[PDB]
Amino acid sequence: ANIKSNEKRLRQNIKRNLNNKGQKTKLKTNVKNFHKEINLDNLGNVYSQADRLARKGIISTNRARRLKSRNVAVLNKTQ
Amino acid sequence: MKRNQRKVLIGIVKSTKNAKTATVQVESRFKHPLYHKSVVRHKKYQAHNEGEVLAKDGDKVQIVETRPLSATKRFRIAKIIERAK
Amino acid sequence: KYTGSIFKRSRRLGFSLLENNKEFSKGKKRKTIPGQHGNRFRSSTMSGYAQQLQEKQRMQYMYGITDKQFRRLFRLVLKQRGNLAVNLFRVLESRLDNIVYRMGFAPTRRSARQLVNHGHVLLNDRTVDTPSIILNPGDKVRLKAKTIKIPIVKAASESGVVSPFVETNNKTFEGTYVRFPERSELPAGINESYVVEWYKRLVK
Amino acid sequence: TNGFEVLTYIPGEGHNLQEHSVTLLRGGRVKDLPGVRYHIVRGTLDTVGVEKRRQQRSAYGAKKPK
Amino acid sequence: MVKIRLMRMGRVHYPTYRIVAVDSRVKRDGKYIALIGHLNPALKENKCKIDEAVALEWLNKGAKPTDTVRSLFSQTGLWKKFVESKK
RNA sequence: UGUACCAUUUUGAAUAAGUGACGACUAACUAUGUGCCAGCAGUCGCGGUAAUACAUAGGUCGCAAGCGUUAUCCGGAUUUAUUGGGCGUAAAGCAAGCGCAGGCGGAUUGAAAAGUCUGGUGUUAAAGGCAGCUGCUUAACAGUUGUAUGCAUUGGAAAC
RNA sequence: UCUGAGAGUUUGAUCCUGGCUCAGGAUUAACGCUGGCGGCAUGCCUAAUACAUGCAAGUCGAUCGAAAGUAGUAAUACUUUAGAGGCGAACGGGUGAGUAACACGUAUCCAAUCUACCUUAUAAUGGGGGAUAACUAGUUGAAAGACUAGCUAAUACCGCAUAAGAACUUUGGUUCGCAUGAAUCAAAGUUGAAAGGACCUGCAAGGGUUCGUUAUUUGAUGAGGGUGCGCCAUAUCAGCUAGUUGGUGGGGUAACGGCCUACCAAGGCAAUGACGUGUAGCUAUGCUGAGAAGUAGAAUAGCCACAAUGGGACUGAGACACGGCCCAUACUCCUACGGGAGGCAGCAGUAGGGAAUUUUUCACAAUGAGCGAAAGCUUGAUGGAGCAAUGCCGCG
Ligand SMILES: [Mg+2]
Ligand SMILES: [Mg+2]
Ligand SMILES: [Mg+2]
Ligand SMILES: [Mg+2]
Ligand SMILES: [Mg+2]
Ligand SMILES: [Mg+2]
Ligand SMILES: [Mg+2]
Ligand SMILES: [Mg+2]
Ligand SMILES: [Mg+2]
Ligand SMILES: [Mg+2]
Ligand SMILES: [Mg+2]
Ligand SMILES: [Mg+2]
Ligand SMILES: [Mg+2]
Ligand SMILES: [Mg+2]
Ligand SMILES: [Mg+2]
Ligand SMILES: [Mg+2]
Ligand SMILES: [Mg+2]
Ligand SMILES: [Mg+2]
Ligand SMILES: [Mg+2]
Ligand SMILES: [Mg+2]
Ligand SMILES: [Mg+2]
Ligand SMILES: [Mg+2]
Ligand SMILES: [Mg+2]
Ligand SMILES: [Mg+2]
Ligand SMILES: [Mg+2]
Ligand SMILES: [Mg+2]
Ligand SMILES: [Mg+2]
Ligand SMILES: [Mg+2]
Ligand SMILES: [Mg+2]
Ligand SMILES: [Mg+2]
Ligand SMILES: [Mg+2]
Ligand SMILES: [Mg+2]
Ligand SMILES: [Mg+2]
Ligand SMILES: [Mg+2]
Ligand SMILES: [Mg+2]
Ligand SMILES: [Mg+2]
Ligand SMILES: [Mg+2]
């Protein structure tokens, strides 16, 4: 009632979930810090983290695009 | 350039008592499946008076569909001939 | 699959297999409908359905056909161009076993079916195993060989009595045929054209 | 097998029904008795066939005399 | 991932194929996009009435043949035009 | 799969016919038994001691490796009638009136072209439908080529 | 060039209105009698009832460590695979429960989208680090396993240098659009890649083919959304709707959107039938009809929905996943009583219901799929063979 492919697939995705959850958390903490003490310096780090996740697929590529556009809107308004 | 052309609908405004809205009604003469006679129908589409168009009640308005701005609103007003009421 | 009392059905309708061998017989020269109830009154005035069914049986008993085969053949010929009153007569007369008896190589029609069923006949360029193949005028239906020596070839080789619509070409047994049968070679045993309308009601 | 009670005529001369038995009803409608609209197929299950019959046996259910 | 491949529509003991452009995930004997031409395992000669028209469009487009499908192209000579048109 | 098929291979009619009906619609009738009893029945209806309608028997009919019965759908049914019905006496004109919405509606001129008509293009998957042809001993069947219907867009017609 | 058959029956007898019945086809058919064979096709319509047992998706050593076996004095040669990794398991197969609405058919707009492998074209494939499966040892057990500590490998993972082009903005031009708005620059800023394997040549150095990889470009297929029209019965169902209608800023979704949020308002649908009830997968089509159309949605084919019931989510290009995961409910089973196991609406088959519908079969040989360079490998899809006059056709 079980398939070796399915069991192995379940065991691998747990480890994948650990690494990907960490990476998503990295993006989350940087953008909250950024918008906290607004500073053009941080913005860059946000760019690096958002683009890296999008290539790996962890985050949908469209999400990197919308986040990038909206954070730049705040800076132009504030600068 | 070559740009696919949108569908159009001709109607009359029935009422307007919200912010930026105009409940228009478009008629048609669909044939009957069996007795083969034209039948007048009535259906009330909604559109938005974003600006420059106003189109208060009683205003004969042309309608072009658009990307859904909200639920049950997918149309926009256009040129107005016979501006009255 | 056939009746074994051909005298009985031939005596009722009145028409035999066109030589009166089943009507003349060697006894009593009986020309009455069979059974005890044969010599009675109330003879004519058969209803249109009554005469049509009796006549329909006549056509399909002259050739050894099952009614379902009849419906199939009628459905085939019906649709084409128009008044096809010349085609279905050729189609009904195009049966392989019918042609072999008319070929003059068999004493009787249903005996020819046995020879056909037993494989003693060859078509133009192939053999025959089924006694229902629809033929077309032009095929050299050459006779078999291992059958020209059997103790029954005597009346078979006497094909000098033959209908004009078949160029048997005996000896060489070319076995071709042409010049499709006119109504003259289809005697008054079954000569009518309202059976087509009867099947028109029964068969769409 | 459902929950409907129907009065069904036993088509034949003689029956083995004993108030408690199983029958395999069919369709019909006897014109003499008002209300009856079904017939019991004879010689199938617990109900016996109709012997002493040589005519139209296929309907009443009797083994070919042979 | 269009793939020119076959589809059985014969009867018991009598197969009958048709060269046809279809997607991989579509069932065999299912939906297809364009018709190329039919085939018969026992037609003796001319066994593959090819089209030579849309087939070149789909192969240039990137249609993926099969092992037996490719085979058919070679006896007629369809592989030659495709490879020389690539060049 | 030693399968389809083939052969002058041995034996040999040898291994193979049932079902419904016979009063009319509906092709096909007599005797025996029973005597409003036993029973038949799709409809009219048969049986009360001379039953071609029941039972049995003989004959005969309609079919055939199938035949009857039952169930369901369509036709016949112009019997919900757009094509294609009616409302005095047979079912059916509200007890009568004022009447909005709806349906219909005098004559002439102009424009537009929503109906209406027409040309071009796209599409309406394949199988099925009809025609022709091929292949299976012909057929059933399979393949093959042809074969519409509607929708949208565009270009004209102006009689209603 | 289409193209249509009637009769019996109210009366003492007649005409008309009018209902009933019959003559014809047809089915996923069943029953009774009987019964020889062959060519095609069909075969749980009921209990989306519960299921014994056996099969129905794996593949690559030419990604990687290790282990084992056979030869060999050794170096090593060959074979095999538990495990790490890549890819496929979302395809294919079945059922029609739910669903009366953008579900479906048709025509469309996506200036509001995705697309792994595949097509074309264009730049790169350099250099480091830290880990854990397998293994060893210990605890706990009959075993499934589980926990703890060390040891390793990479096309697993994580940094770094580097951008032909990309992505995000800035500067003004261009061409403009259908209202939001797109389209193209030149300059600049900001941000961002990976992995090697097999083989040949070469003393070497180096070079090369091919597979594979990162960044792009072209299309195409596939997926998703919106819209017009068509698509059941019922008024002995007249009001329904409070995220329901609209705006604002923000959040979220591949994308637009009360999809979500806070504020501001009170609208929207409805006698041209809302809402409610009952029923039903829709369509191409099957049967029937001269036709208009009536009827069923067999088989098969498209789309949708479902996987004991009800929810949630990971991985992934794609699932909220039939034979993957988590939780609850119901049901069954095993136990050594602590714990567990389970989903035939996949192929057969069993029990039960029914008037009634089949092998607990053979082979991947052909077609089709997944992985692989090939060898191959896996394929109850598929192709055959059983069974049944179930239907058409044919012969005795
Ligand atoms: Mg993802
Ligand atoms: Mg608006
Ligand atoms: Mg009787
Ligand atoms: Mg009698
Ligand atoms: Mg009728
Ligand atoms: Mg009618
Ligand atoms: Mg009338
Ligand atoms: Mg009256
Ligand atoms: Mg009056
Ligand atoms: Mg009155
Ligand atoms: Mg008045
Ligand atoms: Mg009025
Ligand atoms: Mg007028
Ligand atoms: Mg079609
Ligand atoms: Mg066919
Ligand atoms: Mg009378
Ligand atoms: Mg009838
Ligand atoms: Mg292994
Ligand atoms: Mg699936
Ligand atoms: Mg199947
Ligand atoms: Mg089913
Ligand atoms: Mg249902
Ligand atoms: Mg992939
Ligand atoms: Mg390394
Ligand atoms: Mg870097
Ligand atoms: Mg890597
Ligand atoms: Mg809003
Ligand atoms: Mg009619
Ligand atoms: Mg179906
Ligand atoms: Mg079904
Ligand atoms: Mg399962
Ligand atoms: Mg799975
Ligand atoms: Mg099963
Ligand atoms: Mg189930
Ligand atoms: Mg295979
Ligand atoms: Mg049969
Ligand atoms: Mg037959």
Swiss-Prot record, chain A:
Q: Which InterPro entries match?
A: Ribosomal_bS20, Ribosomal_bS20_sf
Where is the signal peptide, in residue numbers?
Answer: none
Keyword Flavoprotein on entry? no
An example molecular function term from Gene Ontology annotations: rRNA binding
Q: Mention any one GO cellular component term assigned to this protein in its UniProt record.
A: ribosome
Keywords for the protein's UniProt record, in alphabetical order: Ribonucleoprotein, Ribosomal protein, RNA-binding, rRNA-binding
**Top-level taxon of origin:** Bacteria
GO process annotations (BP): translation
Q: Family membership, please give it.
A: Belongs to the bacterial ribosomal protein bS20 family.
* Protein's name according to its UniProt entry: Small ribosomal subunit protein bS20
Q: Which organism is it from?
A: Mycoplasma pneumoniae (strain ATCC 29342 / M129 / Subtype 1)
Swiss-Prot record, chain B:
Q: Name one GO molecular function term.
A: rRNA binding
Q: Got a GO cellular component term for this one?
A: cytosolic small ribosomal subunit
Gene Ontology biological process terms in this record: translation
Q: Which UniProt keywords apply?
A: Ribonucleoprotein, Ribosomal protein, RNA-binding, rRNA-binding
**Presence of the UniProt keyword DNA repair in the record:** no
Gene3D superfamilies in the cross-refs: Nucleic acid-binding proteins
Q: Which CDD domains match?
A: Ribosomal_uS17
The cross-references to PANTHER family, in alphabetical order and at most eight, read: 40S RIBOSOMAL PROTEIN S11 FAMILY MEMBER (PTHR10744), SMALL RIBOSOMAL SUBUNIT PROTEIN US17M (PTHR10744:SF1)
Biological role stated in the UniProt entry: One of the primary rRNA binding proteins, it binds specifically to the 5'-end of 16S ribosomal RNA.
Homology family: Belongs to the universal ribosomal protein uS17 family.
Assembly behavior: Part of the 30S ribosomal subunit.
The protein depicted here goes by the name: Small ribosomal subunit protein uS17
Gene field: rpsQ
From Swiss-Prot, chain C:
Q: Which InterPro entries did the record assign? A: Ribosomal_uS4, Ribosomal_uS4_bac-type, Ribosomal_uS4_CS, Ribosomal_uS4_N, S4_RNA-bd, S4_RNA-bd_sf
**What do the Gene Ontology cellular component annotations say?**
small ribosomal subunit
Query: Which UniProt keywords are given for this protein, alphabetically ordered?
Result: Ribonucleoprotein, Ribosomal protein, RNA-binding, rRNA-binding
- A GO biological process this protein is involved in? translation
PROSITE patterns on file: RIBOSOMAL_S4 (PS00632), S4 (PS50889)
Cite the Pfam families for this sequence: Ribosomal_S4, S4
Domain S4 RNA-binding stretches? 94-155
Q: Does the keyword RNA-binding apply?
A: yes
Could you give a GO molecular-function term held by this entry? structural constituent of ribosome
Give the protein's function.
One of the primary rRNA binding proteins, it binds directly to 16S rRNA where it nucleates assembly of the body of the 30S subunit. With S5 and S12 plays an important role in translational accuracy.
The record ties this protein, via NCBIfam families, to:
PRK05327.1, rpsD_bact
Self-association state and partner proteins as the record states:
Part of the 30S ribosomal subunit. Contacts protein S5. The interaction surface between S4 and S5 is involved in control of translational fidelity.
Q: Which family does it belong to?
A: Belongs to the universal ribosomal protein uS4 family.
Output this protein's name. Small ribosomal subunit protein uS4
UniProtKB/Swiss-Prot annotation, chain D:
Q: Which organism is the protein's source?
A: Mycoplasma pneumoniae (strain ATCC 29342 / M129 / Subtype 1) (Mycoplasmoides pneumoniae)
Q: Could you describe the subunit structure of this protein?
A: Part of the 30S ribosomal subunit. Contacts proteins S8 and S17. May interact with IF1 in the 30S initiation complex.
To which protein family does this belong? Belongs to the universal ribosomal protein uS12 family.
Which gene is the coding source of this polypeptide chain? rpsL
In Swiss-Prot or TrEMBL terms, this protein is called Small ribosomal subunit protein uS12
Q: What does this protein do?
A: With S4 and S5 plays an important role in translational accuracy. Interacts with and stabilizes bases of the 16S rRNA that are involved in tRNA selection in the A site and with the mRNA backbone. Located at the interface of the 30S and 50S subunits, it traverses the body of the 30S subunit contacting proteins on the other side and probably holding the rRNA structure together. The combined cluster of proteins S8, S12 and S17 appears to hold together the shoulder and platform of the 30S subunit.
Q: Which domain of life is it from?
A: Bacteria
